Amino acid sequence: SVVQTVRSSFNNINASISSINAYKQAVVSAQSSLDAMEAGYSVGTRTIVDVLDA
């Protein structure tokens, strides 16, 4: 039982690292989309609902 538990914990740490990387990439993508939506609104090609959704 100790064998299996320690192995599982190790794999879990690795999975956590990978998930963190994925989420950082997602955050950057969302920031870019929000900046685009805000600039469009500033120039007058988009409403404010889009800004709030972003």
Add this chain to the structure above:
Amino acid sequence: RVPLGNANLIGREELQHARDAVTSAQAQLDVAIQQYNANQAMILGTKLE
């Protein structure tokens, strides 16, 4: 469409397009009216004889 823009609930390009559409329709009507007037220059509302 104007009232929505008054409250900022539509893009300003949508208002610009609608206003330009009104102006273009007015110009087309002017063309038609002047064409009709040109045709009426050859009659001057006189009898057939």
